[PDB]
Ligand binder design. Structure first.
Ligand SMILES: NC(=O)c1ccc[n+]([C@@H]2O[C@H](COP(=O)([O-])OP(=O)(O)OC[C@H]3O[C@@H](n4cnc5c(N)ncnc54)[C@H](O)[C@@H]3O)[C@@H](O)[C@H]2O)c1
Ligand SMILES: NC(=O)c1ccc[n+]([C@@H]2O[C@H](COP(=O)([O-])OP(=O)(O)OC[C@H]3O[C@@H](n4cnc5c(N)ncnc54)[C@H](O)[C@@H]3O)[C@@H](O)[C@H]2O)c1
Ligand SMILES: N[C@@H](Cc1ccc(O)cc1)C(=O)O
Ligand SMILES: N[C@@H](Cc1ccc(O)cc1)C(=O)O
Lengths: 280, 276
């Protein structure tokens, strides 16, 4: 149960609302006192009646269907409505929402999966479209759940996701792929693993419990993503050289330079990770 | 304070005892009622008196100095002593301990760093050298502190460390190296990061807070890192060829290799972060 920030909101439609993320937001919104209607894959025959008199429309469909879904909403949108999305990429969905709708437009990116037990300390990225004064209530509602909002423009958002998501999930993918080809039994590795070592494997394996299509569409979104993963391969080759050459001091010098780049974050991360495992 | 499993142990010598791991073991053993003498980098001129009447000698020096350090102990060792190590590699240190000492010999590998706040649920690998009946007390003592003992031979230990340590730390090293060359500011990435995404970066940056020498010696294994290089290529090909279904099919096959561990790891990681 959560405080209802805006009691003048009488109907919220979630497009893709039987999905994992859309469903999660539907639950949180219902628990905050807002009536929710769902428009999912088999409901378009009655889109007109589902969307009729909506105050808010939220789009949470597969990345590769998002832009066509936004266009499909066009005939049913009225100017008083808020149009928003939850998509992992922002530049193109935000531009498309602003093109199809003349009213308030808000881009969101929840930086978490649908398996969260609570919204406490989870981050949602805010990219303004139009009329932010009309949707302040929704940003405040999300914070009532305990989430934190961070604001960027949609282009900067996607630029940062190049590193945060495309690079990182590509890398984890390659690590899991590699492990899967090795002549080893995972349970044998786990028996020798203390908590930190178990967590090393968990951070790789947990990726594969999720939807392949999500990670495919994130990584494939733009040519900057291909470019950054091509450079990861070049760096892997550079790192390898130290071990082929048995150049222990070269490795150490590089390790020390990388520590200076992290700065005090290296020691903070060591501490945070230890505390995470100690409690648990 | 921990229960003293064996009250007949009157002197334990830790070679490398002012170090991070040696110092940690010295603190646990002192707290378990065992008198500790330290033999560190400067102390070899008085090694005769340090090692005199020792019941146990534990080696905890840099990996690259470990075998020559064991060799250097031979003149001060007597048959009744227990000789043991904490080294991250087991096959060469164990053999060299069996070579220079006629008495009880035990190989240990603590699977953790010195910054632990307790031994609860930490793993120590056990590789028997000689006369395990003589050192059961110490295996029990370590468990009194809350650690788990897992037993293997030194060859199988070393084989598993290829994957658990060499592979994983090399890959984390290459990822931090790569990140350090990107046109980004870490604080800015962190401000967009929910707890799971902060942990993605934490798991890389925390490597670099530790001793570069340790990871250099552990990694230097080459085969598995060279094959990782081959897998990076296969993975990249999906994105270069815009082969989405290929990627999805490969992702599904990896999930099947992890089996139910994928979902268990998703749950464990969620729980770890929610507790925080
Ligand atoms: N699950 C996550 O970790 C996560 C995290 C952040 C953002 N997102 C975003 O959520 C969206 C994907 O949703 P999900 O991850 O919950 O996956 P999902 O597959 O579980 O949900 C997607 C839903 O959209 C529905 N759908 C498909 N075509 C439709 C159509 N034409 N009209 C209406 N509904 C349609 C599906 O039936 C499904 O219920 C993407 O925008 C993605 O970037 C997901
Ligand atoms: N630190 C870890 O996370 C970790 C984990 C598991 C195992 N280990 C093992 O710990 C051992 C020691 O490393 P540490 O991590 O505590 O690093 P460290 O540098 O803190 O400790 C090494 C100690 O050995 C001393 N030393 C150097 N040369 C010596 C010599 N000739 N004779 C006696 N002492 C000497 C140093 O002065 C120092 O006090 C290695 O065998 C390593 O594999 C370390
Ligand atoms: N990467 C997150 C889930 C997620 C996926 C895609 C996103 O856009 C955001 C979050 C996790 O593994 O838990
Ligand atoms: N890898 C552990 C520390 C460690 C290092 C070497 C070892 O042999 C064992 C454990 C960590 O990052 O916390």
């Amino acid at each position: 149960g959560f405080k209802t920030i805006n009691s003048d909101i009488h109907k919220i439609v979630i497009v893709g609302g039987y999905g994992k993320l859309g469903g999660l937001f539907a639950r949180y919104l219902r628990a905050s006192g807002y009536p929710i209607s769902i428009l999912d894959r088999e409901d378009w025959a009655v889109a007109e009646s589902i969307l009729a008199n909506a105050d808010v429309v939220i789009v949470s469909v597969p990345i590769n269907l998002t832009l066509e879904t936004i266009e499909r909403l066009k005939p049913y949108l009225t100017e008083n409505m808020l149009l928003a999305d939850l998509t992992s990429v922002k530049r193109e969905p935000l531009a498309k929402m602003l093109e199809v709708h003349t009213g308030a437009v808000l881009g969101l990116h929840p930086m978490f999966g649908a398996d969260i037990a609570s919204m406490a300390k989870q981050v949602v990225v805010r990219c303004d479209g139009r009329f932010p004064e009309r949707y302040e209530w929704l940003l405040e509602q999300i914070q009532i759940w305990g989430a934190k909002i961070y604001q960027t423009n949609a282009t900067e958002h996607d630029h940062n996701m190049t590193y945060i998501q495309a690079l990182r999930h590509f890398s984890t993918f390659a690590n899991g792929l590699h492990l899967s080809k090795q002549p080893i039994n995972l349970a044998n590795l786990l028996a020798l693993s203390s908590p930190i070592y178990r967590l090393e494997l968990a951070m790789i394996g947990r990726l594969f419990a999720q939807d392949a299509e999500l990670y495919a569409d994130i990584i494939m979104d733009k040519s900057e993503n291909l470019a950054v993963i091509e450079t990861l391969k070049q760096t892997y080759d550079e790192a390898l050289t130290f071990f082929e050459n048995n150049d222990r001091q070269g490795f150490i010098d590089a390790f020390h330079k990388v520590r200076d780049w992290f700065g005090d974050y290296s020691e903070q991360f060591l501490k945070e990770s230890r505390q995470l495992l100690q409690q648990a």
